[model samples]
Target: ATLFIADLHLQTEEPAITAGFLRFLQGEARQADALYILGDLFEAWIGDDDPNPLHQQIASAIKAVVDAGVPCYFIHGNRDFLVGQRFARQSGMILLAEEERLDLYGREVLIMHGDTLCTDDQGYLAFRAKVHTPWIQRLFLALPLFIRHRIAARMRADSKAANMDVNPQAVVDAMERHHVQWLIHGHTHRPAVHELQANGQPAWRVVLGAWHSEGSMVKVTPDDVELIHFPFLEENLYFQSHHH
Candidate 1:
């Protein structure tokens, strides 16, 4: 089975969530055939150069998963789009483009971070395009670490002040353009599997939720695909009891 996770929103303020993720990497992830992080693994990635211990710890955990022979893949989340090749190499994760297609158990699937589907948010759409430009990103990244963090914090606050949602029409349009039967993404924090028709055929959209007290993951096997959540425990007793 393959495992997919996104919107972890990992930060120093949320130690339990981070611990739970470590447990997940050490346990369930090692058992999976592959691991896909759809996006927003961090609440804010100041840059690859940020010396936050949490970032390095997660990198090491992901690296361990790769060393165990499970290939890990990552798609850029809006918050963490600055995740660079240095960190990707550090974590042994293969960075995928914003939209990537895969053949999963003979099913055609298109995966992305899902922010682009918010075509209705004209202001954010313009801002997104601006920051995503290559030169603009380089200019931002070249700023001092503390300055970059300040800017990132302000930007996140502003975005939170003005929220957005994914447009259904945009979703269907993307599916049609990509010519995929399934679309999987994370951004809106609305976890669901929606049945729709695209390309004059049945289709599905799988949305991944953000982590809070529990971890959300998508499990895909040859037989089925499921979105499951695992709660965070003070200890590893949950896995121990469940496994035993």
Candidate 2:
């Protein structure tokens, strides 16, 4: 089976999330044939050279999965587009192109980080374009680590303040353009399997969930595609009922 996950938004302050992810890495994930991290794995990734112990620890955990024979891959999220080769090497996860394709047990799947499909969020898209410019990224990366952290903190706050939604029209367009029946991604945090017709053919958009209070992942077997969730180490009765 292949595993897919995204949007953990992990940070040092959230020990529960780190613990939950480590458990999965050492437990269920070890049994998977391949693992895809769709994006936003970190709450904020200043750079590969940031020298954060948390980053190193997380990389080590991921390295264990790779050492066990699972091929792990990653796509950059809007929040962590700066993650580069150094971290990828440390984690033993290959960095996939923004829009990646795969032949999944006979199904043609197009995978992404799920942010670009939010065409409705024109403002964010504009900002995304600005930051993605080669010169701008170089300038930003050249800044001191503390300065980058301050900038990232402000951007994260603004992102939290502004709500965004994915556009269904764009999702279908992307599926057709890619000529794939299955489009898997994560970013909206609304995890569900959406079945629709693209270019007169049946298609599916499988959304991975965020790991906030709980853990979420997608298990793709040759026979079935399933969305799975696990409660945090400390279970909350309120969340158990509120989730659906």
Candidate 3:
């Protein structure tokens, strides 16, 4: 069985969601054969160097889960594209390519974080091209840790503001062409299962919700794929009172 989820946006700021994620890791995720995080695992992950107590705690928890025998995989999203090999090694997760063809559940599925498909968002697409350049990333990675942190913070603020101002139709059109029978992504924060026809065959688009109000997971078993939403619990308040 494989489990996929995205748009967690985990950070020191969101203690409730992080606690819920930790519980999920200890419980449901430990039993899975493989786990995939589509993208946006952090609110803004510039690099593995800028350590915060919350980030360290989450990394430790993830490592524990991986040590339990489940293989964990990750894909870079718009928010956390700076996630690099250092963090992957620390968290015990295999970093996946932007687009990958995988055999799962008796089908050949194209898996991605789904950001590349948003071609209509030209401004973002352009920005993505610039920052994701190998040379550019290397340059950024070489800069001072404080410099990188400042840039990441500014970029995150701009991204959030820009996302709010975009046109709805533009957003939809950005994803239309990249639509496949089974496409799973998380940027839009809308969670639902849609049945559609592509290439004269039946297909489905499964969107994973954000991990804010509740916990969201996509479980794929031999028989079917299920999107499970788990509500947050009050008892798991360890990080709530802790200051970042």
lDDT of each: 0.91, 0.91, 0.78
What tens-digit string does per-residue lDDT give for candidate 3 at 208-240?
889989989888888888999887564453544
Where does candidate 3 have its weakest 10-residue lDDT segment?
164-173
Whole-model lDDT for model 2 versus the true structure?
Answer: 0.91
User: Worst ten-residue run, lDDT, model 2?
Assistant: 235-244
TM-scores for every candidate against the unseen true structure? 0.93, 0.92, 0.85
**Cα deviation of 153 in candidate 2 (Å)?**
2.4
- Give lDDT tens digits, candidate 2, residues 1-244: 9999999998899999999899889998899999999999998888899998999999999999999999999999988899999999999999999998898899889999999999988898999999999899999999999999899889878878985668989988889888898999999999999999997888999999999878999989899899999886745555344554
Q: In order, how many clashes per candidate?
A: 0, 0, 1
Model 2 misplacement above 4 A? 158-163, 234-244
User: Which portions of model 3 miss their true places by more than 4 Å?
Assistant: 160-180, 234-244
Off by over 4 Å in 1: 161-163, 234-244
Q: What's the lDDT for residue 200 in model 1?
A: 94
- What is the model-wide C-alpha lDDT for candidate 3? 0.78
